[PDB]
Amino acid sequence: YKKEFAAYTAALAEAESKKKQDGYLSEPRSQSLNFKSEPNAIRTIDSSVHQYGQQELDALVKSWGISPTNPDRKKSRAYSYFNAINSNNTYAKLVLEKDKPVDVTYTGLKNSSFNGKKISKVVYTYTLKETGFNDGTKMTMFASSDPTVTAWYNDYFTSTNINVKVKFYDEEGQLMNLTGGLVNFSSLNRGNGSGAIDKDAIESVRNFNGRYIPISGSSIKIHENNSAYADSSNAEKSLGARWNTSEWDTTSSPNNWYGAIVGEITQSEISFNMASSKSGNIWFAFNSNINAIGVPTKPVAP
Ligand SMILES: [Ca+2]
């Protein structure tokens, strides 16, 4: 402890003098939240909510006009994207109805803590707010077995906006307030769309009820309604990217800060909106694995 504190102090001094450097947090912070990975979480969804079978969802999506036999290339490409994500049956397959919340509860958490206190349960509430798809009242999403991998959702190359509420609970089942915790909003691609629809696909986070901390040099900027996304392509150097997608957009890439922003938690119920334009399939991971360089973990005194 007394040596981790030394080290953490020295790392904050270093984050301060390098804060204007690429990859560094523009305002130095330490991490007190540990919500990094929970591969063996127990996932529970109320029996109220239909969890689709693979072929059952496939037939539903086809009945919506999104099928391989639609002569409209944009529709059939939306199908092959949907089909790909529909092939993993470890996800819970959900049909969101506009304005109707869906809770996804993960218990049996083995790795997570905040400032020394064990996190034993995380609850996600998903509510479709808007889609450019069909009558605008429905969208597919896929809840991960792992709460830190979190979700895929679709837009079928239109647009989707889904509100997410997140609540963390300790071993006593009491609501926890993760104020000061850092969350990783990562992999917010712009310009990585399908060349058959439009290259300027956009992934964003909107309406975050916490405070963003810009990563220096990152393509992800703050906009109105507390929203974070890139202002131009972060996918192709020929459209002005620093790095092509493949050179930064992985969980271990040393350049992954390029598509990320940090979120500082301010409330016990965390809230943001996942929103996409022209993406087809969208991965949205919610966790504490900060992409910024040199963010120290805050040690806890026994
Ligand atoms: Ca992404």
UniProtKB/Swiss-Prot annotation:
Record: residues binding Ca(2+) 1: 187, 189, 203
GO MF, one example: metal ion binding
UniProt entry keywords in alphabetical sequence: Calcium, Cell wall, Isopeptide bond, Metal-binding, Peptidoglycan-anchor, Repeat, Secreted, Signal
Keyword Ribosomal protein: no
Protein's cellular compartments: Secreted, Cell wall
Top-level taxon of origin: Bacteria
GO CC terms: extracellular region
Family listed: Belongs to the antigen I/II family.
More info: S.gordonii, a commensal oral cavity bacteria, is among the bacteria most frequently identified as being the primary etiological agents of subacute infective endocarditis (found in 13% of cases).
Subunit details: Interacts with P.gingivalis fimbrial protein Mfa1.
Function noted in UniProt: May bind sialic acid residues of salivary agglutinin (SAG) in a calcium-dependent reaction. The interaction of SAG with its receptor in various oral streptococci modulate bacterial colonization of oral tissue and is associated with reduced levels of dental caries.
Name of the protein in question: Agglutinin receptor
Organism: Streptococcus gordonii
Residues of the full protein shown: 462 to 763 of 1500
